[PDB]
Amino acid sequence: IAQARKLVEQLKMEANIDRIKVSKAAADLMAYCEAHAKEDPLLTPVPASENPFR
Amino acid sequence: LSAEDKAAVERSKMIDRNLREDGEKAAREVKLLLLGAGESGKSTIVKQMKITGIVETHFTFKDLHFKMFDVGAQRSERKKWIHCFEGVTAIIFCVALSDYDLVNRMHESMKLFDSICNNKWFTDTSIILFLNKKDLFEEKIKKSPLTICYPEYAGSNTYEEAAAYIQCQFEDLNKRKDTKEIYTHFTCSTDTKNVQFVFDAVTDVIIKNNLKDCGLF
Amino acid sequence: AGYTVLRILPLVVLGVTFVLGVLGNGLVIWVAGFRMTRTVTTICYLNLALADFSFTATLPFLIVSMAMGEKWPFGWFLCKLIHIVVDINLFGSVFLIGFIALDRCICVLHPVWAQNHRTVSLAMKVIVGPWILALVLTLPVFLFLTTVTIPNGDTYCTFNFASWGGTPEERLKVAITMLTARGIIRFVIGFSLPMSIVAICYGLIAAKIHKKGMIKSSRPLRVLTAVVASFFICWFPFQLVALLGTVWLKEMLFYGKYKIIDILVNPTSSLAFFNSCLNPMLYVFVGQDFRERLIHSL
Amino acid sequence: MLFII
Amino acid sequence: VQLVESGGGLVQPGGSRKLSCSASGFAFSSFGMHWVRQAPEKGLEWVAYISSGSGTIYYADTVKGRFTISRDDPKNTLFLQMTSLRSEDTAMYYCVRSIYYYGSSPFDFWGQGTTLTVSSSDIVMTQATSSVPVTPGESVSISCRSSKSLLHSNGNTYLYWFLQRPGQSPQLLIYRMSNLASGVPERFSGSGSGTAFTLTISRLEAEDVGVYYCMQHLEYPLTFGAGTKLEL
Amino acid sequence: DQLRQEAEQLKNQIRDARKACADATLSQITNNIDPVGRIQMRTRRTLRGHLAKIYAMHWGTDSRLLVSASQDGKLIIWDSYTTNKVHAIPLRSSWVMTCAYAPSGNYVACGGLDNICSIYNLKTREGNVRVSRELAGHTGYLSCCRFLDDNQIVTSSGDTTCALWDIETGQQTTTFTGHTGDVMSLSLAPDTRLFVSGACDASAKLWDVREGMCRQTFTGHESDINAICFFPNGNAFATGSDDATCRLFDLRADQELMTYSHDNIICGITSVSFSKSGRLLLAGYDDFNCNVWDALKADRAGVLAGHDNRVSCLGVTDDGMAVATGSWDSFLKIWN
Ligand SMILES: CCCCCCCCCCCCCCCC(=O)O
């Protein structure tokens, strides 16, 4: 029965969280991806001179 | 061309040479995996062989080095680590004949045998099956009938028929009867018989593998 | 009177050998040497493939020569290179087949010894032995072959011992017994040693498997027969004609006798060359792993 | 191997 | 990690002698071993180099052909065979260990060295100053120049800095022009561009006094600088 | 018995309180962004030298050195730029299922069926690599080990418990209990104050390193979880499963954002890694080809098919220059 005790405490602690809307999270992810998009070697091929692998 | 990395290339080639030599040394040894349900059988068979994780035992018989990985102590989901033993030459499976009446144990052993024998990682891996506790089975079979474990059994309560029936029951689980051979043996008090049987089985598996690579099979 | 078919046949068989052999050996060299992992079997097969591929690709030049009645429309440099390549590859193929048989017999008859003392390093070191035997046994060709030219005629590629000095009769003596010795070696090292090893080893493998009851289908006794028979059928006619000729060389050259041997040599040669095309099929394609890796690679 | 005589 | 050398003594001109260095406290098999000698009241010069596994051996031009270097890894000893000794070869021979891999520090440890007395193209590295007046508590800089640019295509400048305290073996300070060696206080700092190089001691103390040396590892033979002496 | 139904109500309460915030899916939010639909990656280096299956690889912070573990009992540190080998560490236990490379570069970690995480000292006065501490204390097998810093290592075992260790003392400091099944993966946030562990119970749990309490719990996978990775921001993490499905969870929202699935894929996912920008999701697959998923639109931008057998370990460099994919065929490939 101790397992029920621990599960109840854990769920109670989990329930009280200041959740945020899905839209705000979506906007945040889009903002980060756009902000760091240019400095990403995988998305756009880098010039062969600047590429450390040849 | 290069300035100081030539020494690095020399170091890399020397490391490659050491790894290739180690790989040859490892490839020489034959790997066996030990499985079962009852710890008594595992302990007896391990002790019979010449001699907290998985225990590795080394024994040499007839100039053939063996490696036995006991994984009994690993209490976890077997599916997530069983694939690490895909290349083992043979699987040594231990079942207790004295556990037919004690508790459903024999049914559990059959379930485990079915689970590992038909597994997709061991399609072509021979399974050596050792039936332990022969003497206790001899003593108990006189009093407690074998009917308790298998309702369908219709036979004399004698050692030869009961042993043959149990062996036939275990050997019938392998759905794939062409690429796998289930060698069966009843453990003897002498270490020599058990080690010799394991050596015969592994030599047969080695010959079969060599023929399979060369196309004859 | 219908002997035209006898002349045309060798050309057709050699051409089929050229197309099938270059495709077959090429697939073996790519699939085994590059795509698959290196094991003793893969090294021995790759060596057989290299030998056959070299002979197969040096075959077109021979197809022209045979068609033109032993006339070489090529210079001295190609003649020494082509007749050196053909003759270091044909000995190579026969020797390697003997090595592959000895390897299989050591793996099956003595399993523990192979498991504990057979690995890529010893194999690559000992695979040189068949090739060095071939190079030592093809030195008669570098030392004594050339193109003699016949006035009012095209040149012909034949052994010429004229440069070795002495009376013309001395030249006759050096040519005869030496050519006779070459023909004998072509039989004893060329067929006896490889045929004896291949049949003795494959027979012993058959005996061991049956005693232990490991035959569960028709493949075990089908491939073994296929390999021993393929080698005997392909090489026994050629070796027999060559041996009869070497024994009767004096009669043929001096008295123009036993003319049948001359007409038979090109047809009987066609089967021997055909063995090079059959070898990739009866030694690598049958295996399960090779087929699987090829199908993925395609 | 080739008979060249 | 200690290296002790043996075999040093008086030798008559034209004779032969074998120098032995025994290594204890580290894995000798995986280290390339060098030989560096120092003539009395003079600078260092490279003598020989044997790599791990004995695969590659290089010798300096002055002692080419008459010197033999060999190693016995099972016994953890290094052998230098000297033949046809001449007056120019009088020096204190030091033994140095170097391991080469990405991020390694070559020439990290130097042996005590033994004295050998004999009775009676290359990249030049130039140190502008023989000696500099220095006082404790003040920053100083030592300059170094090279004939050829040391910046290889990899991006690593193969310059090494060394310190030899009076009465001791040389010790490594900066390797590859910008990396501090293990155990060297942070006050030492090094920077260089192209051929011109500089080593800076932010705050000097009593132990820092000695003769400083330059090394180039771009090509063989390795060449050292004349030596800059700091005195208090 | 009263606790069982009361807990059930709380589970319902979580679903309702979280159903409320799900105003829209991210598929609608990014319906207008440009698709990055041309991602062709070619093999650049082929690290070679292992003789058995490879189960883990980790990149260094310098973005050049990488360590790979294999069942032959060897740990190799590879120089990616030149294909050279820097060290070959012979393990005591040949059964290794994870490897970690310390951020400082001084140490490496390995673990497996022995139940012991070994810490190796790369930089020593002697030339060889030595073992510094042999961590013990897990009953189950080790699935993943990651270094918080030079002195603290967090490890997941197969006994449902993830643990944090102090390397110098050799003693467990905090135990994270709460999973009901074998834990298979650990990913550490960029700030190194949180880590997410995925278990065979089909639930991913977010922990806090300082207090050892399960801060949040995420579910939605039908089957086991095999790989987990944080988004660079550290406010989202993607998870791989055996049902051929990847999901992107949010730490703040507490819910699923996208499901990365295709009908043609019916194999498990062995490794998940993100790109430096977060716009590419690299997911390893058992079909022998790792797949590049566009994170914002759930469409497969590209495929990497240079593996003979199943992809196992995959990692993206800190600088984003390369994606190294290990496989059971004993070959690593660096794909730029
Ligand atoms: C002209 C006739 C010559 C006869 C030469 C025969 C050569 C003997 C070859 C033996 C092959 C098999 C050897 C035994 C192998 C084994 O012990 O497993």
Nearest Cα neighbor of E29 from F311, B18, B194 is B18
Task: Name the residue of C118, C201, C208 whose CB sits within 8 Å of the most ligand 1 atoms, as the mutation to test its pocket.
Answer: C201
Residue F316, both tokens: 């993206």
For residue C283, the CA-to-ligand 1 centroid distance in Å is 21
The CATH number covering residue F47 comes to 2.130.10.10
Q: Residue B52 has what DSSP assignment?
A: -
Largest CA distance in chain E: 50
Helices C193-211 and C76-109 meet at what angle, rounded to 10?
20
User: Would you say E182 and E104 are in contact if contact means Cβ atoms under 8 Å apart?
Assistant: no
Query: What is the layout of strands, in order, in the sheet containing F300-304?
Result: F272-274, F280-283, F290-294, F300-304
Domain boundary among E61, E93, E118: E118
Nearest to F295, CA basis, from F316, F272, F284, F279: F279
Distance in angstroms (rounded) separating the CA atoms of residues C252 and B148:
91
Given the structure tokens 């270059």, which residue do they identify? C22
| Residue E181 DSSP symbol | P
Nearest to E108 by CA among E43, E167, E26, E188: E26
Say which DSSP state C40 is in: H
How many C-alpha atoms does E126 have within 13 Å on its Cβ side? 8
E123/E117 Cα distance (integer angstroms): 28
Provide the total of helices (H) and of strands (E) in chain B, helices listed first: 6, 6
Pick the residue whose CA is nearest to atom 12 on ligand 1.
C201
Judge residue C30's burial from the number of C-beta atoms within 10 Å of its C-beta, 0-12 exposed, 13-18 middle, 19 or more buried.
middle
How far away, in angstroms, is C201 Cα from ligand 1 center? 8
Facing residues of F281 across strands? F274, F293
User: What is the secondary structure of C165-202 as a DSSP string?
Assistant: -S-HHHHHHHHHHHHHHHHHHHHIIIIIHHHHHHHHHH
Burial of E107 (0-12, 13-18, 19+ CB in 10 A): buried
What 8-state DSSP symbol labels residue E91? E
Residue A15 CA to residue F10 CA, distance in Å, equals: 8
| Touching chains, F (3+ CB pairs < 8 A) | A, B, E
Distance of CA A45 to the CA centre of its chain: 24
Per-residue burial over F147-182, b = 16 or more CB atoms within 10 Å of its CB, e = otherwise: bbeeebbbbbbbbbbbbbbebeeeebebebebbebb
Phi and psi at residue A42, to the nearest 5°: -70, -40
Distance from residue B61's CA to the centre of ligand 1 (Å): 29
- Three-state SS sequence of C236-261: HHHHHHHHHHHHCHHHHHHHCCCCHH
Token readout for E44 is: 């260092």
- Minimal CA–CA distance to F50: which of B19, C71, E155? B19
Let me know how long chain D is: 5
For residue A43, what is the nearest residue in chain F, using CA coordinates?
A: F39
* Phi, psi for E61 (deg, rounded to 5): -75, -35
C13, C153, C175: which is closest to C69 by C-alpha? C153
Same domain, E150 and E226: yes
| Residue B54, both tokens | 């998985």
Give yes or no for a contact between E48 and E60, defined as CB atoms under 8 angstroms apart.
yes
Helix (H, G, I), strand (E, B) or coil at B76: coil
**Between C40-67 and C76-109, two packed helices, what is the crossing angle to 10 degrees?**
150
Q: Which of C104, C193, C198, C209 to mutate to test the pocket of ligand 1 (most atoms within 8 A of CB)?
A: C193
Structure tokens at E25: 């406290």
C-beta of residue B7 within 8 angstroms of C-beta of residue F85: no
Q: Contact A29/F296 with Cβ under 8 angstroms?
A: yes
DSSP letter string over F16-64?
A: HHHHTT--S-HHHHTTTSPP-------EEEEEE---S-EEEEEE-TTSS
F226: helix, strand or coil: strand
Judge if E203 and E157 occupy the same domain: yes
**Where are the extended beta strands (E) located within chain B?**
30-36, 55-61, 64-70, 90-96, 126-132, 182-186
Top mutation candidate among C106, C117, C189, C197 for ligand 1, by most atoms within 8 Å of CB: C197
Give residue C206 CA to ligand 1 midpoint distance, Å: 16
Contact E212, E142 (CB under 8 A): yes
What SS3 class is residue B73? coil
DSSP assigned state of E51? -
Whether residue B74 and residue F72 make contact (CB cut-off 8 A), yes or no, is: no
Please report the atom of ligand 1 found closest to the CA of residue C110.
Answer: 18
Which residues are within 8 A (CB) of E10 and not within 5 positions of it... i.e. 6 or more apart?
E117, E118, E119
C100/C286 Cα distance (integer angstroms): 15
Gap between the Cα atoms of E77 and E24, Å rounded? 9
Give me the sign of the Cα torsion angle C171, C174, C177, C182: negative
Question: For chain E, how big is the Rg over CA atoms in Å?
Answer: 18
Question: What's the CA gap between F257 and F249, in Å, rounded?
Answer: 6
Cα dihedral value B20, B25, B30, B34, nearest 10: -90
The answer to whether F241 and F225 have CB atoms below 8 angstroms apart is yes
Provide the b/e sequence for B115-151 (b: ≥16 CB within 10 Å): ebbebeebeebbbbbbbbbbeebeebbeeeebeebbe
E139 and E64 within one domain: no
Q: Give me the number of domains chain F comprises.
A: 1
Do A29 and F322 lie within an 8 Å CB cutoff? Answer: no
Distance from the Cα of E31 to chain B's closest Cα (Å) equals 10
Angle, CA of E176, E181 and E187, to the nearest 5°? 100
| Residue F165 contacts residue F152 (beta carbons within 8 Å) | yes
E37 within 8 A of E45, measured Cβ to Cβ:
yes
The residue assigned the tokens 């020096």 is E91
Look at the alpha carbons of F190, F274, A42, E151 in this order and tell me if their dihedral is positive or negative.
Answer: positive
- What is the DSSP code (8-state) at residue E31? S
Distance CA F188, CA A7 (A): 25
Q: Does B75 touch chain F (CB under 8 A)?
A: yes
List Cα–Cα distances, F72 to B54, C115, F330, in angstroms. Answer: 16, 18, 10
- Which residue does chain C place closest to D3, by CA atoms? C242
Domain co-membership, E107 together with E140: no
- Kindly state the helix (H) or strand (E) to which residue F289 belongs, with its residue range: none
* Total length of chain E: 232
DSSP alpha helix (H) spans, chain E: none
CA distances from B62 to C109, C113, E65 (A): 15, 10, 53
Helix/strand/coil (H/E/C) assignment for every residue in B6-47: HHHHHHHHHHHHHHHHHHHHHHHCEEEEEEECCHHHHHHHHH
Q: Which two tokens stand for residue E212?
A: 């400083």
Tokens read off for A10 = 């854990």
Answer yes or no: do E30 and F128 touch at CB < 8 A.
yes
Tokens of B168: 């036939």
State the CATH number of the domain containing residue E134: 2.60.40.10
Domain boundaries, chain C: 1-298
* Structural domain total, chain E: 2
Classify each residue of B189-211 as buried b or exposed e, where b means 16 or more C-beta atoms within 10 Å of its C-beta.
Answer: eeeeebbebbbebbbbbbbbbbb
Of B20, B27, B216, the CB nearest to C220: B216
Q: CA of E159: which chain B residue's CA is closest?
A: B4
Q: Residues with Cβ < 8 Å from B51, sequence gap 6 or more?
A: B57, B59
What DSSP assignment string belongs to F155-195?
EEESSS-EEEEETTT-SEEEEE---SS-EEEEEE-TTSSEE
Q: Name the 3-class secondary structure at F122.
A: coil
- Structural domain containing residue A51: 1-54
Measured on CA atoms in the order B144, B149, B155, B160, is the torsion positive or negative?
A: negative
Neighbours of chain B (3+ CB pairs under 8 A): C, E, F
Contact yes or no for F26/F257 (Cβ under 8 A):
yes
Q: How far is Cα F80 from Cα F60, in angstroms, rounded to an integer?
A: 10
Q: In whole angstroms, what is the distance from residue B132 CA to residue B39 CA?
A: 11
Residue F303 host element (H or E): strand F300-304
Q: Indicate the residue of E53, E106, E158 with minimum beta-carbon distance to B10.
A: E53
Cis peptide before E133 (omega within 30 of 0): no
Whole-number Å distance between alpha carbons of F94 and C282: 39
Please report, for residues E47, F18, F184, the alpha-carbon distance to residue F177 in angstroms, rounded to integers and kept in the order given: 63, 25, 14
Resolution as reported, in Å: 3.1
Touch criterion met for E and C (3+ Cβ pairs within 8 Å): no
Tokens at E82, concatenated:
């000297």
- b/e code E195-210 from CB counts within 10 Å (16+ = b): bebebebeebeeebbb
